[PDB]
C-alpha cells in the first residue's frame, strides 16, 4: 500500500509537542516524538493520541527514546537543544549563547538521520538557527535542497501580525518578509510589505500608518523573541514556531510550491555561498526548489550582508569546536 | 439564546446550490434556498441535508418557493436571473444582454428584502453585475455599506491563477487585483501583482515570465467568463463564483477585515460617485467598511474611468426600462 | 520526489464536477476530469482551477476527452452514464432502467483502467450500482479489494439524517447503516441505529420517537433517490453522492480504516459469493480491507437475501447483453 | 454589528494556552487568557497572535490579569487551580487532594462571572471536577443549564482510543461513553460500546477482541490520567483535556446539539438531584439542553450510584470548608 506520511520530531519539548498536536489536528501523517528524556515523549504521545480521537482524525503518535524509530520518515523536524543558557538573566537572553550546548546535538542527530532516514526533508529549529542547520547538513550528508532552517516564516509572521494589527486588516492580506540571520541583525523588508499587493507606502501617504510606527514595528519584530522570553519567564515561544515549521512541512508533503522565507543553503545567490541564511524560497516536493534572489536596494543589501557576517562570526565559533 | 447564522440564497441554480454546499461543508450557518421554480430547491435542499450528515456538520438546509422564508437572514446572496440571453449564440455571449431580463428580478428581490430582512448584508451576483447591484440597492432601501456585488474576487482569482500557473508557485502567494466593471473593460492591475509582496516586475527582469506572457494573461482574465461559457455549452461558471461570494460572506459573518475587490457604492473615491463598481475594500461586520483608493497612475486611472463609463452606459438602459 | 496524489474522475457531469470541487477544497490531490462530451470538462476544470486559488489550495485540475490522462491515478471514481432512462417519466424512474445504457460504458472504462492505471483504487458510482461495479471489476482485471461501489454511505447518510432530524441531535452522533442492493430492496438496519452507541429503542421507550415514525423513515430512506428525482425535474442527487464517494477516497488515500457500508465483492460472507452488494467494510490503504459480517437476525437475514436476489436478477440482464 | 464570539479562558497554564491555540486554529472567536500570574498570559497571547497570522485566521488573543476583561464573554472555560498536591509523589497522585486548594478559587471565579458575564456558558475543568463545578455554580448564580464540567468527553475519548486501537479502526467509528464521577469510580460503559452502531459484543464473538482485553481497556481508561502523570513527570494531561473542552464550547457556540458526556446538574435523573455528575447530554445554544437518561442495567446503575456516592463524599469536604 501507499503508507501514511511519517513525520519524526527530534525533540519532544514545547515546540515538538505543539507540532505533534498540529499534525494530529490536521491529520498530516503519523508522528514519532523522539527525546533523550525517558517516559516524557511517551506520555505526550498518549495525550496526543487521545486528542486525535476527539478530533476524529486518524494518526498514530508514538513516543520514543530510540533513533531507530525515525526510519522511513518523510519529514524530520529538529528542536533538540537548550532554550536559555544556564547563568544568564532573561533580559540578556541571546540565541548566540546556545551555540556551545547545541552544536554537538546537531552532529548526533545528523548521524542518525544519515543512518535511518537519508531521504527525509529536514527542518531545523534549534538555535542559533543559521549555524545549527549548517552543522546538521554537514554531519547528515543530505542534499543541499533537503535541509533548511525555520526562522523566516516565524519572523515574517511577526512582522505581518504587527502591521496587520496597526492597519486593522486580516493578516492573510498582509505580505511581509524578514530575511537574513535569525537574530538581532534580521532584516524586516519594509519596502516589500504589501496589503494584497498594495504597497505599504500608499497607506503611509494616506496617513493610515506613520513611518515612525513602521520603524517601531521593525524593531519590535527584531526583538519579538526576547519580548516573549521576558513575559513567559520560563523557556521561549512555541505556538508560532511550531506552526511555522508545520507550514514548511505541509509545503513539502503536498508539493505546494509555497513562497516562504527559510534558512537555505546558498550557492552564489546574494553574493554568498556555502552557508545557510534566511532567504525567500519555493518549497515543494523537492525541498528547497528555488532560492529567490530579491532585487534588494544597496541599503537593503548592506543590511543583508551585515546579517550574513553575523552568521560567519557564529560559524567561526562552530569551527573552534 | 444565540441562534446559528442564517444565510438566504435567492436563486437556487448552479451558483446558489454550490454556495449552499460550501455553507454545509464549512458549517457557516443554516441555509435557505429560494427559487421561483417549484420543487427544485426542495430537492436540492434534501440532497444538501444528506451531504451535511456525511460532513459531520450541523446545518439546516431549507428549500422554498416563498420569499417569507428569508425573514431574519444575516446574509442574503442573490443569483436569481438568466445566464445567457435568449436567441443569442455562445460566441456572442455578453453579460450586457442579460440586463432587461435580470433588472426586473433585482427590483422584486429588493422589495422583499425591504420587508423581510432589511438588516441583512446582501451580496449580489446576478449579471450584468455592477448595474444589477445598483438596482437591488435602490429598491431594497438598504444602507450603502450593506450591499455589494461579487465580481472582483472572481476576476482576481482568475488573474492570480493564471500568474501562479505561469510562475509555478502557490496561488496563496500571488496577489493580483482586477478592478472596474465586471465585463470586457475590467482592469487587471499588472503593476500591483506581487508574489508574497515581491513585484511581478522582478520576475520579468529575471526572465521567469515575459511582458508578452503577462499581456496574454491580462486578456485571458478579461475573456475568462466567455471562455468558460463557450467550453461548457450550458450556462456559465459557478464553482469559482460560488467560492468568491462565500469568501465575502465569511468576511462579514466573522468580522474578518478582509481586503477584497468588490463592486461597492462610491462616494467620491476615484473621482466617482453614486454607482457601484469594482474597487478594493475592507469587508467586516459592518459590511463594506472602507473603500480603498489606490494611487493609480494616469494610465491606470484612464483605464478605470473607461471601465466606469461602461457601467454608466448600462445604467442608461436601466433608466430606459423604468427601473430607476 | 513524492508526487501529489492523482485522482481521476471518469465522468464530469454533476457528481464528477462536484467531487472535483471537494478535491480542490480539501486539497486531496491533483484532479483529472474526463468526459466524452468535448470541451465541457475543460471548461469545468478552468472554473475549478480558479476556485482553488480562492481556497488557497494547491491542486491541478485537468479537463480531458482522452483516457490516456488517467495514467498513474491513485484513485479513479466513475460516474459516466445516464441518470434517467430515455422515454420514461420521472414518476416511474428506476435505476434498473439504466442498465443497458450504462453497462457498456463500464466495460469500456474497465478496458482503459486495465492498461492505464491498474494499481488504482476504483470507486464506481454509475447506476444500477451493484451490477455496474461488477461489470467494471470483471472488465478491468483489478483485484477484488481494489474495486467497490459507493452506495451504502449515501443510503446511510439519508437514514442518519432522517433519524437525527426527528431526534433533534447532531448527525455526527447518529450511527445508521443501510445494507444490500442500492435500490428499492435496500435494508435500513433499524436494530443497529444508535445515538452515540445508545440503542434507538431507548428513545422509542421514552417516547422521543415512535415505531410508526421509524417505519416511515425506513421507507423514506428507500425512496429517497426517487424523491429527489421527482423534485429536481432534471437529473438526480449529486451533492451527497459526491461527498460519499470522496469520504471513501479519503479513507483509501490516508489509510484511515473507516467503517463504511460499500458495495463489495463477497467471498462467502452472509452465505453469498461472487457478487458486489452493500455491506459494512473497513476501508484503508489496501482498499476493501475487510468485509464485516453482521450477526443479523433471521428476519434481517431474509431481508438481505431478498436484496441480494434483486442484484442476481439484474445480473441476468447483464449476461443477456453479452457483457459477462 | 454582530461581533465575533468571545471566549474567556480563566487560567492560562497548559490547558488554557492549548485551548487558546485551538481557538486560533479554528477561528472560533476572540480569546481572553486570564491568569493571576503577571506577564505570562500576555506572553502566550503574543505567541498565539503570531500563530493566528501563520494560520491565516482572524482572532484577537488578549492576555490579562484583570477579571473585568471577561465582560461579554459567550463562553468561559475555567482551568484555574493546582494540578498536583504539594507533598505527594506521582504514583500516589489523586484528584481528591486538590480539593482544599481549588475550591476557594472556584468561589472567586464564580463571583467574577456573576459580575462580568452572567450570560456566559461556563465549562469547568479544574479538579476535583464534579464538586468544583458545583462550587462554581453556587457562587456564580448562573442557570443550571449554563454551567457544566468537562470530564466525560476526555474519559470517553480515552475509552474510544483504546478500543479503536485494539480493533484497528478509525476512532471516528467507535462510540464509547464513560459516565459518573471523573475519578477512580468513573464507569466505562462496555455494553454501550459500538463500531458504527455494531455492538462490541459481535467483535468478541468473532474473536477480534477478548473480554480480558476489554476488561484491561476499562481499567486503563480509569487510570489514564495517572498513567500520563507518571510518564510526564511534571503536571498532567493537556492536549486531550483542551480538545475536549473546545468540542463542548463549539457545540454551544454553533448550537450543534452534540451528544456529549459532561458533568451536568441533575434534577432527578438516575435517581439523584442537586449535584453535578457525568452523564450523556445534548449540548447546544441553550447549554445543557437535555440530560439523557440511559436504560442502565441494575449492575451498571449500581456502579453509577457508587460513583455518585464518591461525589457526595467530596461534597462533604466542600461543606467543611
Ligand atoms: N525561530 C526559531 O528557529 C526558534 C527556535 N527555537 C529553539 O528551538 C529549540 C527547542 O525549543 P523548545 O522546544 O521550546 O525547548 P524545550 O526545552 O521545551 O525542548 C527541547 C527538548 O530537546 C530535548 N533534547 C536535548 N538533547 C537532545 C538530544 N541529544 N536528542 C534529542 N532530544 C534532545 C530535551 O530533552 C527537550 O525535551 C531551542 O534550541 C530554541 O532556542 C525556539 C523558538 C523559535
Ligand atoms: N462574477 C459574477 O458576478 C458572476 C455572475 N454570474 C451570474 O449569476 C447568475 C446566476 O448564475 P447561475 O447560478 O449559474 O444560473 P442558473 O440558471 O443555474 O440559476 C439561476 C436561478 O435563478 C432562478 N430565478 C429566476 N428568476 C427568479 C426569481 N424571480 N426569484 C428567484 N429565483 C429566480 C432560476 O429559476 C434559476 O434556478 C446569472 O445572472 C449569471 O450571469 C455568473 C457567474 C459569475
Ligand atoms: N449512490 C449511487 O451510487 C448514485 C449513483 N448515481 C448515478 O451516477 C451517475 C452519474 O450521475 P450524474 O453525475 O448526476 O450524471 P450526469 O448526467 O450529470 O453526468 C454523467 C456524465 O457521464 C458522461 N458520460 C457518458 N458516457 C461516458 C463515457 N463513455 N465516458 C465518460 N463519460 C461519459 C456524460 O457526458 C455526463 O457528463 C448516474 O448513472 C447516476 O444514476 C447517482 C446518484 C447516486
Ligand atoms: N478532565 C478534567 O477535568 C481535567 C482537569 N484537569 C485540571 O485542570 C486544572 C488546570 O490544569 P493545567 O492547565 O494543566 O494546570 P497549570 O498549572 O498548567 O495551569 C493552572 C493555571 O491556573 C492559574 N491560577 C491559579 N489560581 C488562579 C486564580 N485564582 N485565578 C486565575 N488563575 C489561577 C495558575 O497561575 C496557572 O497558570 C487542574 O486543576 C487540573 O487538575 C486537568 C486535566 C483533565
Ligand atoms: Na534527503
Ligand atoms: Na443564490
Ligand atoms: Na443560482
Ligand atoms: Na468580489
Ligand atoms: Na472588480
Ligand atoms: Na474574469
Ligand atoms: Na462563465
Ligand atoms: Na471574464
Ligand atoms: Na466521476
Ligand atoms: Na458526473
Ligand atoms: Na458506499
Ligand atoms: Na448498502
Ligand atoms: Na437512499
Ligand atoms: Na436522486
Ligand atoms: Na433511494
Ligand atoms: Na449564563
Ligand 5 centre to CA of A152 (Å) is 21
Strand order in the sheet with B198-199: B174-175, B194-195, B198-199
C-alpha cell of residue C147:
474495486
**By what method was this entry solved?**
X-ray
C2, C4, C285 member nearest A1 (Cβ): C285
Per the structure block, which three cell numbers stand in for D263? 458533568
Tell which phi-psi region holds residue D32, choosing left (phi > 0), alpha (psi between -120 and 50) or beta: beta
Kindly list the residues from chain C whose CB atom is less than 8 angstroms away from the CB atom of residue B42: 231
Closest-CA distance of chain A to residue B75, Å:
20
- For A43, which of D49, D160, D228 is closest by C-beta distance? D228
d(C-alpha B198, C-alpha B180), whole Å: 24
For chain A, the helix, strand and coil percentages under 3-state DSSP, each to the nearest 5: 50, 20, 30
Q: Give the closest residue to A8 by CA, choosing from A80, A102, A71.
A: A71
Instruction: Give the experimental resolution in Å.
Output: 1.2
Helix (H) and strand (E) counts in chain A: 10, 14
Using an 8 Å CB-CB cutoff, list chain C residues near A1: 255, 284-286
Contact between C96 and C314 (Cβ < 8 Å): yes
**Residues spanned by CATH 3.90.110.10 within chain D?**
152-321
- Name the closest residue on chain A to residue D244, using Cα atoms: A54
Measuring CA to CA, how many Å separate D277 from each of C196, C242, C264, D237, D238? 19, 42, 44, 21, 21
Please report how many Cα atoms fall inside a 13 Å half-sphere around the Cα of residue D284, on the Cβ side: 18
CB D118 within 8 Å of CB D141: yes
Ligand 4 proximity of D43 Cβ (cutoff 6 Å): no
Q: By C-alpha distance, which of D14, D12, D292, D262 is closest to D121? A: D262
Of the candidates C80, C178, C147, which has an alpha carbon nearest to the alpha carbon of residue C286? Answer: C147
- CB contact under 8 Å between D51 and A240, yes or no, is yes
Residue with the nearest Cα to atom 41 of ligand 3? C83
If interface means Cβ-Cβ distance under 8 Å, which residues of chain A face chain C?
1-4, 27, 58, 74, 253-257, 285-286
- The sign of the dihedral angle between the CA atoms of A24, A28, A31, A33 is negative
CATH class name, domain B152-324: alpha beta
- Report residue C222 as a C-alpha cell: 428507500
Long-range own/partner contacts, residues B13-18 (CB < 8 A, 24 or more apart): B13/B79, B13/B235, B14/B235, B14/B238, B15/B79, B15/B125, B15/B238, B15/B241, B15/B242, B15/B245, B16/B77, B16/B79, B17/B44, B17/B48, B17/C239, B18/B238, B18/B239, B18/B242, B18/C21
Rg of chain B over all Cα atoms, to the nearest angstrom: 19
Cis peptide upstream of residue B133 (ω within 30 degrees of 0)? no
CA distance B313 to B307: 10
Those residues with Cβ within 8 angstroms of residue D102's Cβ, 6 or more apart along the chain or in another chain? D80, D81, D82, D126, D127, D128, D132
Choose, out of D50, D246, D256, the residue to mutate when testing the contact with A (most A CBs < 10 Å). Answer: D50
Question: What does the alpha-carbon distance between residue B102 and residue B10 come to, in Å, rounded to a whole number?
Answer: 13
* A46 C-alpha to ligand 1 centroid (Å): 20
Contact B4 D257 (CB under 8 A): no
- Strands B75-78 and B6-10 come out as parallel
Query: What are the distances in angstroms from CA B26 to CA B156, B217, B249, C25?
Result: 23, 32, 12, 10
Q: Which CATH architecture has domain C1-151?
A: 3-Layer(aba) Sandwich (3.40)
Nearest to D175 by CA among C161, A53, C191: A53
Question: What is the secondary structure of B84-151 as a DSSP string?
Answer: S-TT--STT--GGGGHHHHHHHHHHHHHHHHHH-TTSEEEE--SSHHHHHHHHHHHH---GGGEEE--
Ligand 1: which of A14, A15, A78 to mutate, most ligand atoms within 8 Å of CB? A15
The answer to whether residues B202 and A295 touch, using CB atoms and an 8 Å cutoff, is: yes
Place of cell 482544599: D100
Q: Say which of A175, A205, A258 has its CB closest to residue B175.
A: A175
Mutate to test the interface with D, among B1, B72, B249 (most CBs of D within 10 A): B1
Q: Which ligand is nearest to the CA of D120?
A: 20
How are beta strands C121-124 and C75-78 bridged, if at all? parallel
Please name the helix (run of DSSP H) or strand (run of DSSP E) that holds residue C74, with its range, or none: none
Nearest to D27 among B74, B254, B286 (CB): B254
Helix (H) / strand (E) element for D127: namely: none
Backbone φ/ψ region at D81: left (φ over 0), alpha (ψ -120 to 50), beta: left
C-alpha cell at D235: 503536571
Residue closest to D248 by CA, chosen among D269, D217, D278, D272: D278
- Write phi, then psi, for C196 (nearest 5 degrees): 50, 40
Give the residue numbers in C contacting A (CB under 8 Å), as ranges.
Answer: 1-4, 27, 58, 74, 253-257, 284-286
How far B52 CA sits from the closest chain D CA (Å)? Answer: 12
Distance of CA B194 to the CA centre of its chain: 23
Nearest-CA neighbor of B222 among B280, B306, B299, B281?
B306
> Is-contact D122 D113, C-beta < 8 A?
yes
Strands (E), B227-286: 258-267, 273-284
CB neighbourhood size of B313 (10 A):
12
| Pairing of β C273-284 and β C258-267 | antiparallel
Q: How many helices (H) and strands (E) does chain B have?
A: 10, 14
| D308, HSE (Cβ side, Cα atoms, 13 Å) | 20
What is the CATH number that goes with domain D152-321? 3.90.110.10
Closest Cα partner for D154 from D261, D219, D237, D244?
D244
Q: Which of C11, C36, C122 to mutate to test the pocket of ligand 3 (most atoms within 8 A of CB)?
A: C11
From-to residues of CATH 3.40.50.720 in chain C? 1-151
Number of H helices, E strands in chain D: 10, 14
First to last CA, chain A: 46
Please report the DSSP string for A262-315 in residue order.
EEEEEESGGG-EEEEEEEEEEEETTEEEEE------HHHHHHHHHHHHHHHHHH
End-to-end CA distance of chain C: 41
Give bridge partners of residue C33 from the DSSP assignment. Answer: C9, C63
For chain A, which chains pass the contact test of at least 3 CB pairs under 8 Å? B, C, D
Residue B224's φ and ψ, nearest 5 degrees, are -65, -40
Total Cβ atoms within 10 A of residue D158:
31
Q: In what order do the strands lie in the sheet with A194-195?
A: A174-175, A194-195, A198-199
Number of H helices, E strands in chain C: 10, 14
Q: Which chain C residues contact residue A27 at CB under 8 A? A: 254
Give the Cα separation of D22 and A55 in Å (integer). Answer: 11
* Residues sharing a CB contact under 8 Å with residue B3, sequence separation 6 or more, in sequence order: D255, D285
Contact C40 B239 (CB under 8 A): no
C35 lines ligand 3 (CB under 6 A): yes
Q: What is the C-alpha to C-alpha distance for residues C106 and A135, in angstroms, rounded to an integer?
A: 57
Sign of CA dihedral A134, A138, A144, A146: negative
Sequence-distant (≥ 6) Cβ neighbours of residue B287 within 8 angstroms:
B121, B143, B145, B146, B147, B148, B252
Q: Which residue from D75, D84, D127, D83 is spatially nearest to D106, judged by alpha carbons? A: D127
Written as nine digits, the cell of D133 is 463545578
DSSP-derived pairing of the beta strands C147-149 and C121-124:
parallel
Q: For C141-147, which contacts have Cβ atoms below 8 Å and span 24 or more sequence positions?
A: C141/C110, C141/C114, C142/C113, C142/C114, C142/C118, C143/C287, C144/C265, C144/C267, C144/C288, C145/C265, C145/C286, C145/C287, C145/C288, C145/C289, C146/C119, C146/C120, C146/C121, C146/C122, C146/C287, C146/C288, C147/C121, C147/C122, C147/C265, C147/C287
Q: Find out whether C31 and C3 touch, Cβ atoms under 8 Å.
A: no
- The answer to whether the CB of C90 falls within 8 A of the CB of C230 is yes
Phi, psi torsion values for C296, nearest 5 degrees: -70, 145
**How many C-beta atoms surround the C-beta of residue C101 within 10 A?**
14
Q: How far is CA C261 from the centre of its chain?
A: 9
CATH 3.90.110.10 residue spans of chain B:
152-324
* CA distance linking residue C24 with residue C9, whole number of Å: 13
Amino acid at each position: 500500500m501507499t503508507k501514511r506520511k511519517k513525520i519524526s520530531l527530534i525533540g519532544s519539548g514545547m515546540i515538538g509537542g505543539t507540532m505533534a498536536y498540529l499534525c494530529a489536528q490536521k491529520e498530516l501523517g503519523d508522528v514519532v516524538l523522539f527525546d533523550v528524556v525517558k517516559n516524557m515523549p511517551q506520555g505526550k504521545a498518549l495525550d496526543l493520541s487521545h486528542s486525535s480521537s476527539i478530533a476524529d482524525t486518524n494518526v498514530k503518535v508514538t513516543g520514543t527514546n530510540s533513533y531507530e524509530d525515525i526510519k522511513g520518515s518523510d519529514v524530520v523536524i529538529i528542536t533538540a537543544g537548550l532554550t536559555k543558557a544556564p547563568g544568564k538573566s532573561d533580559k540578556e537572553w541571546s540565541r548566540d549563547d546556545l551555540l556551545p550546548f547545541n552544536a554537538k546535538i546537531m552532529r548526533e542527530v545528523g548521524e542518525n538521520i544519515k543512518k535511518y532516514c537519508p531521504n527525509a526533508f529536514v527542518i531545523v529549529i534549534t538555535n542559533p538557527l543559521d549555524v545549527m542547520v549548517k552543522v546538521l547538513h554537514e554531519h547528515s550528508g543530505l542534499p543541499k535542497n533537503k535541509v533548511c532552517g525555520m526562522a523566516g516564516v516565524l519572523d515574517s509572521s511577526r512582522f505581518r501580525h504587527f502591521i496587520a494589527e496597526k492597519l486593522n486588516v486580516s493578516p492573510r492580506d498582509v505580505q511581509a518578509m524578514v530575511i537574513g540571520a535569525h537574530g538581532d541583525k534580521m532584516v524586516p523588508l519594509t519596502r516589500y510589505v504589501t496589503v494584497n499587493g498594495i504597497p505599504l507606502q500608499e497607506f503611509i501617504k494616506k496617513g493610515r500608518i506613520t513611518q515612525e510606527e513602521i520603524d517601531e514595528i521593525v524593531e519590535r519584530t527584531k526583538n519579538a523573541g526576547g519580548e516573549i522570553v521576558n513575559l513567559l519567564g520560563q523557556g521561549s515561544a512555541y505556538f508560532a514556531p511550531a506552526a511555522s515549521a508545520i507550514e514548511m512541512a505541509e509545503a513539502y508533503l503536498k508539493d505546494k510550491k509555497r513562497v516562504l522565507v527559510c534558512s537555505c543553503y546558498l550557492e552564489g545567490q546574494y553574493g554568498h555561498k556555502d552557508m545557510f541564511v534566511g532567504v525567500p524560497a519555493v518549497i515543494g516536493g523537492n525541498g528547497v526548489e528555488k532560492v529567490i534572489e530579491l532585487e534588494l536596494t544597496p541599503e537593503e543589501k548592506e543590511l543583508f550582508d551585515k546579517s550574513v557576517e553575523e552568521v560567519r562570526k557564529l560559524q567561526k565559533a562552530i569551527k573552534a569546536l
